[PDB]
Amino acid sequence: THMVSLPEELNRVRLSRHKLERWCHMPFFAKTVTGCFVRIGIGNHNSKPVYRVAEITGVVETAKVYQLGGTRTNKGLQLRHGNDQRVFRLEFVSNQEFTESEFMKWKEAMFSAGMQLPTLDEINKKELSIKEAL
């Protein structure tokens, strides 16, 4: 049984910000997005933007309603990166795909944390479930 090992594979279950925005008022937003991954902007280093791979483990409420695209929302994503779990507004989710470097960093962070990687089959099944639902 084969584990994820390439960014191209993990990109298959990467949700863009556009999609999150399109879907954020849908009735089964939580079920759909949970198990997917995102490329999240976590801040700047030397005034340059830094991004990480993270898995969505749930949907939660933020303190404030905020502006997201042309709507308004109270939803935040519970995100996991190795052992680091944090809540992020949807606005910091990128529309660009993972780089190989971001992916490798994630892999190493998952190993250091003693976390099991997703299998290729889990990925493909998740993706398929989303494509079928649309």
Binding site: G41, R89, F92, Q96
Partner: peptide, 8 residues
């Protein structure tokens, strides 16, 4: 595209 804002 439309610049992704950074957390913080």
């Amino acid at each position: 595209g439309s610049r992704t804002p950074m957390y913080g």
